[PDB]
Amino acid sequence: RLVQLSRHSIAFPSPEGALREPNGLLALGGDLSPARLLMAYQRGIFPWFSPGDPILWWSPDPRAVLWPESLHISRSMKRFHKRSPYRVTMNYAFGQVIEGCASDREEGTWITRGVVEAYHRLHELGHAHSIEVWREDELVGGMYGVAQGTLFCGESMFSRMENASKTALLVFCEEFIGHGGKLIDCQVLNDHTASLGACEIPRRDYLNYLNQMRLGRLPNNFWVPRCLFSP
């Protein structure tokens, strides 16, 4: 299997052909052009690879996902948010947010300048979005991802101050479900993501949901840059 892409085509092989180990490895090569990424997200595929390696494309089985309404907020966090010291915005500083996720030397080490430029293009074309957390005038956290109708693909999140991440995710979810949102894609289940309510589901089911929710929509102004939470 494992198809090798090229500049001559933006089409990917079927997700069902992905490898078992590593989980979901479907293709390598191509580029991070706006059209190829959209095609990918449209088919439940996403790019991830370490700096120095060719572009690797995935669609694991199972797929880690998060039902907005199932977001788990600790009793402590709720008390924290009740008197939150942060304010949350939407699409105010995408560059800073993705650069925030990049600078942390962990899972975000895969975010190279090439990746940053690629997603900043999707954000400029209106498909990639960011939620920003502010402490005074400083960005202390947030998250970003690619929208797919009523489905949201969460690429990553970062935090430079206690409870910043949870805040962005807490408020976003309220906003999301409040206006039609139905699902958040987390790709691969991990400890932190699992502690927040993320659960695994068969890839085939994820695909069902995806081509089902990508043709849906949220209010015309749902992604317009604005303030989301401010006491």
Ligand X SMILES: CC(C)C[C@H](N)C(=O)O
CB of 145 vs ligand X, minimal distance in Å? 7
Residue 52 to residue 106: CA distance in whole angstroms? 16
Residue 89 to residue 225: CA distance in whole angstroms? 7
CB of 92 vs its own copies, minimal distance in Å? 6
- 77's contact among its own copies, ligand X, none, with CB below 5 to 8 A by partner kind, is none
Give the 3-state secondary structure of 150-175.
CEEEEEEEEECCCCHHHHHHHHHHHH
Exactly one of 80, 134, 144, 176 binds its own copies (CB under 8 A); that residue is: 134
CB nearer its own copies, residue 8 or residue 105: 8
Give me the amino acid identity at 74.
Answer: S
186 sits near ligand X (criterion: CB under 6 A): yes
CB of 88 vs its own copies, minimal distance in Å? 12
50 sits near its own copies (criterion: CB under 8 A): no
Which CA distances in Å does 18 have to 60, 153, 197, 210, 225?
7, 19, 26, 17, 37
**Site residues for ligand X, window 160-179 (CB under 6 A)?**
169
**8 A C-beta contact, residue 224 and residue 190:** no
156 sits near ligand X (criterion: CB under 6 A): yes
**Site residues for its own copies, window 54-93 (CB under 8 A)?**
87, 89, 92-93
**Site residues for ligand X, window 58-77 (CB under 6 A)?**
66
Q: Which residues contact 49 (CB under 8 A, 6 or more apart)?
A: 55, 56, 110
CB nearer its own copies, residue 117 or residue 190: 117
> Taking CB positions, which residue lies at the least distance from ligand X?
154
Annotate each residue in 138-177 with x if it binds its own copies (CB under 8 A) or - if it does not, as one string.
-x---------x----------------------------
Residue 110: how many CB atoms within 10 A of its CB? 17
- 8's contact among ligand X, its own copies, none, with CB below 5 to 8 A by partner kind, is its own copies
Place of tokens 């927040």: 196
State the number of CA atoms in the 13 A half-sphere of 203 facing the CB: 19
β-strand pairing of 25-28 with 46-47? unpaired
**8 A C-beta contact, residue 31 and residue 117:** no
Structure tokens at 108: 């975000």
Binding region for its own copies (CB under 8 A): 7-11, 30-31, 33-36, 38-39, 42, 87, 89, 92-96, 123-127, 134, 136-137, 139, 149, 214-217, 220-221, 223-227, 230
